[PDB]
Amino acid sequence: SCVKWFIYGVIAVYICYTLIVHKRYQEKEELTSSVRVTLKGVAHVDRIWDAAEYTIPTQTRDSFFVMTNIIRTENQIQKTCPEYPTAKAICSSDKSCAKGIVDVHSNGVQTGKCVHYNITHKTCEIKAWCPVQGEERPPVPAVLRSSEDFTVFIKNNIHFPTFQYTVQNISPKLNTSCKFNKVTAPLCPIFRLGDILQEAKENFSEMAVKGGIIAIEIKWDCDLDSWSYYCSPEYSFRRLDDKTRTQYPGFSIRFARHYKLPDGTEQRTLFKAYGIRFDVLVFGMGGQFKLIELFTFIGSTIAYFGLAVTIIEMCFHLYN
Template sequence: MPACCSCSDVFQYETNKVTRIQSMNYGTIKWFFHVIIFSYVCFALVSDKLYQRKEPVISSVHTKVKGIAEVKEEIVENGVKKLVHSVFDTADYTFPLQGNSFFVMTNFLKTEGQEQRLCPEYPTRRTLCSSDRGCKKGWMDPQSKGIQTGRCVVYEGKQKTCEVSAWCPIEAVEEAPRPALLNSAENFTVLIKNNIDFPGHNYTTRNILPGLNITCTFHKTQNPQCPIFRLGDIFRETGDNFSDVAIQIRQVLQGKQC
C-alpha cells in the first residue's frame, strides 16, 4: 500500500500562473461589466436607497389639560367699580383640539352686556366719518366687527364713526391685562399621549409605559418617562417666565427621535 505522503511533499507549494492577454475586445467587455455593476450599486445605495425598507407610520396624539384657576376681574356696574371672583375649569379655558395641538387661555379681554343691535363702530382710521357719505350700507370691512348701515353716528363726544349691525357695544382695542388673569395656569398640567403604529412590521408603541403611575408629574431626572407636564415647567425649560408670556401666545411642539 503506497504511503499517503512523503517528506518531500511537505516542502512543496502551488501557485497559479497568470497570463496577461493584450486584447481590445476582452478589455472592452471587462470594463463594460465593471461599469454596469458600479452604476447599479450607486443607483441602489445613493439614489433609490434599495437597502432601506420604507413603511408608513401612523401616529396619533391626544392631549388633556387639567387645573382650576380663580380669576379676579374689576368691572364697572352702574358707574361703580366692583371686584368679581370667578372660577375657571377645563371647559372654560380650553378650546376644541385642532390637529395635534391644544389651546389654553391664560388671559382675555371681556366686553360686558353685548347683544345684537345697531351701534357705532370702534374708532379707527377706517371707521371714522364726518357724514353719511363716509359710510357704505352693507359694507363689511375684514377688520370690522359688523356690517355698516350707511349712517354716521356719534361714538363719544364729537367723535363720529360708521354705524354697524353687530354684537354691541363693540369690543374696544385695549392692552391685555397685566398680570394675566389666569396667571395661576402655571400650575395646570397637560397629559400628552402619543401612539405610534408601524403596520408593515405589525408593531405599536406609545409614550405611556405599562405600569406607569398616572398621578406622576414629569421631572428631568426623577420622572423622565412621565407624560404629564406642568405648564410652568415647560416655560421654565424654554428659559421664559410664565407670568411674562401668559399674556401672549406660546406654541409647544412634540418630536420623537428613533
Template sequence: MAGCCTSVCDFIVEYDTPRIVLIKNRKVGVVNRVVQLAILAYVIGWVLVWEKGYQEFDSTIGSVTTKVKGIAITNSTPLEEHIWDAADYVIPSQEENSFFVMTNVILTKNQVQGRCPELPNERTRCKSDIDCASGYYNIHSNGVLTGKCVKYNEEVKTCEIFAWCPVENDTVIPKPAILGAAENFTVLIKNNIAFPKFNFSKRNILTNVSASYLKSCQFNRKNDPFCPIFRLGDMVQEAGQDFQKLAVQGGVMGILIEWNCNLDQPPSKCVPKYVFRRLDNKNFGETISPGFNFRFAKYFRNTNGTETRTLFKTYGIRFEIELFGHAGKFNIIPTMINIGSGLALLGMATILCDIIVLYFLKKSNYYKEKKYKYVEDYELGIESETSYGATQNSGTTN
C-alpha cells in the same frame, strides 16, 4: 475609415482577463493597507454597527389623545371673580394630535344686534353724515354703516354701524395674562404606536405602572422620564421660552414624540423620547399679527326674547403633537447585502493603487509591461510555432 473599422473590430474580438502582479513598493503597499482598513472601518463600524445595517426597518404608525387638567381663579375687570376649569380654557375640548389652552382673553359682554358708533380709526372718524356712506362695509368693519355720524365719546365722532353692540375694543391686550396660572396646568398624553412589519405595538404608559402612580407622577427628564403627565410651564421652559411672556399673545408649541426601537432587545427597552420646540416666530416686535388668537361667542336669550352674546377674543398656546420614529430587527438579507457591498468596496483600494503605480511613479512604464501581457490569436500562435519548428528541422537535415 478602414483604420477606424479595424480598431472597432479589434475591440469587439478582444478579451481581457485579470493578471496578478505582486509589486513590492513600500509606499504603494502602505496606501493599499490604509485604504482597505478605512473601507473595513466604514463597513463594519458605520454601516453594520452604527447604522445597524444588519437590520430591516419599519416606520411607526400611531395615535395620540390628550386630557388637560387644572383650575384657576381670576378677579379682574371685566371678568370679576371667576373660576376657570378645563371646560372653559381648552377650546375645542378634543382635537386630533393637538390641543389649545387659553391664557389670555378680551371679553365683550352683553352684545345685542343694533346700532352703535364704530371704533375710531382713520376710516371711521367723521364730521357729518356725508362722511358715512350708508350700506358700506369692508372686511375690517365691525358692521354695516347706517349713514349717520354720531358721538363715540365727548371728543370723537365716528360713523354709526349696524352690528353686535357694543363693539369689541381689542386695542389693549391684558398684561400680565389673565390666565397666567395656566403655567401649572397639566396634560396627560396617551400615545399608542405600532410597527406593522414586525407585529409590534406599545403605548407610552408603561405596563408596570398603577393608577395611583398616574395620579401623583409628573414628567421630569432626570427623575421621572416615563411619566405621561406634563406640566405646561415645564414644556415651555424646556423649549427655552418664558411662559408668562408667551401667555400674553399666545403662540404655537411642538411636542415631538420619537420612538426609535431596536427590536433585537427586550420590548421594555422600546420607550419614547420627548422633545419640546417653539414653532411660531417668538420675536413679536418683528412679526405682523404675532402670537395665536381667535374669537368665539356664547349666546343667550333674555326673558324678553332678545338674543345676546358674550364675545371672547382668546389668546393662548396651541400644542401640536408630532409622532415619528422607526424600529429595526435582524434580517439576513440586508446583512448579506451590506457585507457584499463592503467586499465590493475593497476593490477601490486596488483601483487607487493601480492609478498610482501606472501613472504617477517614475517606473510606471516598467510596471505597465509587467501588468499587461498582449497575446495574439491562439491559432496564429500555433501556426507560427509549427513554421518555426519546420525551419529548424530543415536546417538540421541540411
C-alpha cells in the same frame, strides 16, 4: 506592501462600521403615532375656568389649545351702535361716514350717521352685534395667567405595523404624582405648562398675554432587537411664532355663546380668547433584525468591495 493591507484594513473596518453603527442588518420602518392629551387645572378670576371653560372640544390628533387671556363682551344684540374707534372709523361729521360696508375691517354695515362712542370721540354708526367688542388691547396681566400651573398628560402610543410592535411613553405602572424629568422620570408624560415654556426658553407670564405657538417634539429612535433594546422618547420644546412685536406674534380664537331671551330674540356673548396652541409633532423610526437585509448587505459589499479588492490587487501587481 504595507500600504496595500492598510487599504484592505480600511475597507474591512469601514464595512464593519457600516454594518454595526448604521445597523444595515435590520429593516427600518417609520412609526405610526397616536396622541391624546388631558388637561388638569382651574383658574378662579371673576369666573371659574375649569377645563370645560378654557378649552374647546378637541377632535384634532396632533394639537391642543389652552386659553391664557380673554376679552369677553356679553349680551350683544343685533341693532345699531357706534363702530369701534378705528383710524377709518373716527368721524367729526356725518359726511365722513359712508353708507354700507366700506372696508374689511368694519364690524357691520354703516348707516352713515356719526354718533358718539365715548364722551370724547365720535365714530360711524353701524348695524352690528352691539355693543361692538372694544378692548382690542388684551389685559395688562393675562386673565388666565394661572394656567402656568396647569398640567398636561400626553399619551403617546407608537406603532411599527410591519414589526407588529407597539410602545407608549408611559411606564408600566405610573404614579400620577409625577412630573416629567429627563433623567429621573423619562416615562412620566405629565408636564406643567410653565415648565414647557421654560424648556422652550420662554416666559409664560409674558407669552400668556397675547398667546403663541409651542411645538412639543417627541422623537422615537427604536431598536427592537433583544440584544440592545432601546425604545424610549426624547422630548424637545420650541416656540414656532416669531416673538418680535412688529411681526404679528401670538394666537387667538374667536367664538360666541348664543342665547335666546324669553322674548325669542337671539343675543350672544362674544369671546376673543388669546392662548397657546401646543402642536405635538411625533416623528421617529424603528428597526429590527431581518435575514433578507443582512444577506443583501453581504452580497452588496461582496460585489462592490470585491471588485475594489481585485482592482487594487492587480494594480499593485501590474506596477511593481
